[PDB]
Amino acid sequence: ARAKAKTRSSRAGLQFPVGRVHRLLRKGNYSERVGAGAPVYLAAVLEYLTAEILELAGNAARDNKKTRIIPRHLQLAIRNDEELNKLLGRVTIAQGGVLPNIQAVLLPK
Amino acid sequence: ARAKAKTRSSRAGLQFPVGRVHRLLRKGNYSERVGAGAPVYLAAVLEYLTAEILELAGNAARDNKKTRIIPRHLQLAIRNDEELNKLLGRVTIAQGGVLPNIQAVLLPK
Amino acid sequence: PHRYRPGTVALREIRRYQKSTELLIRKLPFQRLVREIAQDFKTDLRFQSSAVMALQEACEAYLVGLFEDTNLCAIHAKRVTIMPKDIQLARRIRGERA
Amino acid sequence: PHRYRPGTVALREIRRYQKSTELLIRKLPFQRLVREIAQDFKTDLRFQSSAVMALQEACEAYLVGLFEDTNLCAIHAKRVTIMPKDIQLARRIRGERA
Amino acid sequence: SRKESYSIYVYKVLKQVHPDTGISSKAMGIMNSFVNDIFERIAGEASRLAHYNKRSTITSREIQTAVRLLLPGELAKHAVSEGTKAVTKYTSA
Amino acid sequence: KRSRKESYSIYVYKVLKQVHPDTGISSKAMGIMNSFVNDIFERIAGEASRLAHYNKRSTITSREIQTAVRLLLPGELAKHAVSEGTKAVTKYTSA
Amino acid sequence: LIVEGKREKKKVERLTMFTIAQGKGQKLCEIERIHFFLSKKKTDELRNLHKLLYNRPGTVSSLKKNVGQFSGFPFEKGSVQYKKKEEMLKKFRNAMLKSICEVLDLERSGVNSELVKRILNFLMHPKP
Amino acid sequence: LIVEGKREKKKVERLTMFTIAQGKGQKLCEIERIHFFLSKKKTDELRNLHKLLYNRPGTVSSLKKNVGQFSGFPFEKGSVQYKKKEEMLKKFRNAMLKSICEVLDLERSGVNSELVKRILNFLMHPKP
Amino acid sequence: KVLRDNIQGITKPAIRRLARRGGVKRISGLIYEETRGVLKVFLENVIRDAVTYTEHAKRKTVTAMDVVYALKRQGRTLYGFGG
Amino acid sequence: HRKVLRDNIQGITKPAIRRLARRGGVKRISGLIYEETRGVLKVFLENVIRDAVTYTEHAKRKTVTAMDVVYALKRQGRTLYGFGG
DNA sequence: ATCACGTAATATTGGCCAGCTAGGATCACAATCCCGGTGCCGAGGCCGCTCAATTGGTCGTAGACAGCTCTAGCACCGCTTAAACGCACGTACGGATTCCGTACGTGCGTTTAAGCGGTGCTAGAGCTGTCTACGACCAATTGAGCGGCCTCGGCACCGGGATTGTGATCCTAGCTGGCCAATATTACGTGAT
DNA sequence: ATCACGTAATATTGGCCAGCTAGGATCACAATCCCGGTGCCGAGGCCGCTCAATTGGTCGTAGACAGCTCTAGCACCGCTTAAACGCACGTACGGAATCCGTACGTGCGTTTAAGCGGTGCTAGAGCTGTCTACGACCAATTGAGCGGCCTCGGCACCGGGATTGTGATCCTAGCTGGCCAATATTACGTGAT
């Protein structure tokens, strides 16, 4: 009388947890009521942003010949992207460091 | 036999509305449940801040010999007070203009 | 017969437009500009008068604060005159970049 | 006999401390400072290690961005050396009202 | 339909602070926006506090903490004083 | 005994192996990505709640999330996020 | 609402904050008459002369060597540069013009307008 | 928690942003000999002297007259200012020192250290 | 129809007035185009957010409250417009 | 058990400020920059730690945690990742 | 005795040889770079469990939809006039150049205290159970709040007078330039060789 | 006949006279302030009437509180260097001074279109009514996620070579200063007055 369990993330073709996002939206007092497509949409958005960040960071790492991402790679990916650096402009990453940027007038001639 | 009704404002010694604040807190979706002293305390805080601004604005208006307060007077009060200017820093006030401030170097010698 | 030396009428205009609060951009041009911009985001839009007035107040306050920061940058550069580099610096420090 | 001309070491240090990510303030003195400051807000306090490390990361990122803005202000003034006026300007612009 | 506001309450506070003084409609709209802004800030910080401590209830303590966090300096002190006084009074009756 | 805490770590691992199968990530970087997920979640959900309140509606649906995305995320980021969200909602409704 | 490609990454725009023109004539150093003057002269009279040849005054050390290599003015009579030099000569005090004549072996006995004309003709074609 | 008093009103701190020192002796314009030399001399020469006297060069216009107004050095022999002028003098080329001696009616014949001493004594007490 | 080249309605003297209200005494000639660009950017962002709030309200009319929310988003809260 | 810890700002030494500046792209540094920076940092720390100790007392704790610091900074508009932001 | 003149001793100046400084090229040292080996520890996988996610049914209500009103946004005209525009002109400003002093940068030896690892204590985080006080909820009440309407007074604007201020004009004193007369230079006549 | 030299004409320069310019003081005019006066229109009050605030009661459960476990913070110690400090020194930098060119401010006359009011039309905001799809909730089920454990992969670090950037040194070249020889100046003896 019970069908084989199939999680919402699987019903949406995602990796992030739809059930957990539903739970957090309900427990965050964001709204008295929460639709069924809201957590799906939100998880898909989070998954896309995560994938963007990780794509750029893995590219940065491969540029430094590294197979393993560390905070500096995330800082590079973020600050070298116009949209991410706008989204996370008021954000500080621990052990991220800075982007190499010597102003030209300081270089000798 | 029904006791005469006095508003929660009278019982607290305020001019601001406690019932309205309790309703907005209940209808503002800030928390599932709301205590009894929360709207009272909050209304008292709002009354205090309002009174502080109106004191400063009325002073400014008396300086210009004006009896009615206008947005310019509110801007003068706010920006001339440090704590208010701090809290209301990014706040923009329509028809409030700016403070007379000419940098010295621009003045003639 | 009479001719003010440059910089005098400017200080007078400063004291004037600081003693006052009237909007300094003409309304109809600003409204046409707003509709032009919006028409690139959605077509056949309508604006309340209060909405245009709000956008105008916001823009004037924003540009006024920007010009304050710009005059500070200029003065910092030992220059009375403001220049585009001053604006770019003010915005880069404000976080508006560009 | 070898001596580097002023500036060369500074640029090397710049390249170095930008390639790197370690914290640049010593941890013990910064911790003592945090506790000194907190004594004025509450007494007999306790700090988690992660809490002090977080305060340290934040204060270093803040000072680094401040020095970026300060170098920009300096350059704007046709200088290379940063001065207190440059910091005061960067702060007055960022909205900290120095 | 009836719209809500804070106007009469501001006129009451004013008369208590400046019985000789009045206020214009525009200034009143500014004061109304100021009240609503402060309200939203304090209530947001209070809700966030309750959530951080996994509390389902907002009480005078949460509001007092949100005040300490938001209002700056002697303002915070005198607001905490005025709120504690008001809660004391309300509890007495 | 029983101590439970939640994070997004394994989901970030999964996304990574989808985009960079031969690549890994450290624990510090994973904590940073967890903070990033929680931050963007709080931002989007707060914008969506405020939207529902502005319009005096008691429910958060795909529309509020879509608007909050289009408002918070910048430029092409918003377009591609909307695309992903719509695709996911479509697939979900086709149960 | 659904796109068809990958995000077009947008590149961030970070805010990024002594040619001796040889003219027509002999170098003032190769003219022994004028060269003997400069040897007897000091970096002050030459300083007046240089504030005239290259618009901007030179450095105590350079001033000397620079006046030494003046090969003449590469422009002709009536050019905008000729008029602009003639005005700069009219704006010099008559004692200065007499000092410049003495540095160029020109006669220091003439009306202002003649001292101007005789210096300006010499500065086109420095002749021994 | 209840503070029984009025609130202090704080104020926002906005980010706000040719004296001839008369010495001892006589003005170089009164001394007949020196005044006659300046009349015969030119703006050029006084560029080096105006640097020596007031630690700054002077306008081509207000140069000869300001050097004449020089009535002496208000400091005495052995002061930090005396030592700082003596070094300046040691750093001048021998031809310059001989030109400065000729502008002050001092004898141009002498060793560098004597030209320095004779100019420095004159610049304390300009005597006719 | 369609409005075009309406940025130029933000005229040189109007920018001059704004500057004066900001404490400016002397102004370059390039300041005017820089300011027009700055303003066009500001308005693009504010009006994008406002039109977003509008469509989300299923309206075809932009209200003042939409503008107020948009500015609040840009971090430039505005008082006196129904806030 | 309890001892006052005075003059601890001076533990933010000249070379440490120099390092921070270098990480910020600075080449040449005045001598007054050091005290200005110490004051700036003491102010920043005072505000952040005030907000954190506030969150703490509110939580009925006597120990300042990393979450208190993160919330305090997040409040100051300086969100921090890596500590559970 | 004082003074003019020739002679001798002392002193100055032009020429020369030597010293000093400039620029370019060459060379050595150090920093940066790379490349392979090592171990080390954190990343990543596996597994039992549990608790949070899923499923299936019931139910109430939030919100989609349709229809009506009427408010308000848009478009359009004509007049007035202040603002915008275009141009002429000149002052004050920005930029460039030079110079000078000293404040920073760099290197070095000494000091000092950060960092690490180890031991002991203990306060307080964190969790669980009890339970009471408190808040949510509903029904009747009711009275504060608010929209509509009227009406005076604060104020914004006009004209007149008055005050502060800026720009221009006028006067006084010093320096520079031209003109005229005295004196040095050059050519011719005349005296000596 | 050639050379040297007195005298006259020519040329250069100092004294005198006149013009020009910089600084200070004065005045004329023009923006700002003050003072009424006044018409207006928006604040301020009033009124009746609706729906949000209130009183009262009841009941579920949030969280205050006590008690226990045990993690993590704290204090202390002792080495071990790496970093910090003090200092000497010198050079690149900041600041000040000077000057020039022209860009921007100011003002005038002409053109434009903003503003203002009035008129007409109609989209769509806003409200109400309806009916229903959808989300909340509960109970039962179950599998994904979390924690603990383990075990090797990635990486840092080091030592040994290669390359490169920077600074010091060497070479050729130009300019200036000390020394030497020739010559001018000065003190003195002798002669004249």
Residue numbers in the entry:
A (entry chain G), B (entry chain C): 10 to 118
C (entry chain E), D (entry chain A): 38 to 135
E (entry chain D): 32 to 124
F (entry chain H): 27 to 121
G (entry chain K), H (entry chain L): 52 to 68, 78 to 188
I (entry chain F): 20 to 102
J (entry chain B): 18 to 102
Task: Pull verbatim passages from the article behind this deposition.
Eukaryotic genomic DNA is folded into chromatin, in which the nucleosome is the basic unit. Here we identify DEK, whose function is unknown, as a nucleosome-binding protein. Cryo-electron microscopy structures of the DEK–nucleosome complexes reveal that DEK binds the nucleosome by its tripartite DNA-binding mode on the dyad and linker DNAs and interacts with the nucleosomal acidic patch by its newly identified histone-binding region. The DEK–nucleosome interaction mediates linker DNA reorientation and induces chromatin compaction, which may facilitate PRC2 activation.
Consistent with the gel mobility shift assay and the mass photometric analysis, we obtained two structures, the complex with two DEK molecules bound to the nucleosome (DEK2–nucleosome) and that with one DEK molecule bound to the nucleosome (DEK1–nucleosome), at 2.8-Å and 3.2-Å resolutions, respectively. Consequently, the two DEK molecules are tightly bound to the nucleosome in the dual-tripartite DNA-binding form (two symmetric DEK SAP domains in a tripartite DNA-binding form). We found that the linker DNAs are sharply bent in the DEK2–nucleosome complex and their orientations shift toward opposite sides compared to those in the free and H1–nucleosome complexes (side views). Therefore, the binding of two DEK molecules induces substantial linker DNA bending in the nucleosome, which may lead to topological changes in the nucleosomal DNA. Surprisingly, the binding of two DEK molecules to the nucleosome substantially bends the linker DNAs and compacts the chromatin conformation. This remarkable linker DNA bending found in the DEK2–nucleosome complex has not been reported for other proteins complexed with the nucleosome.
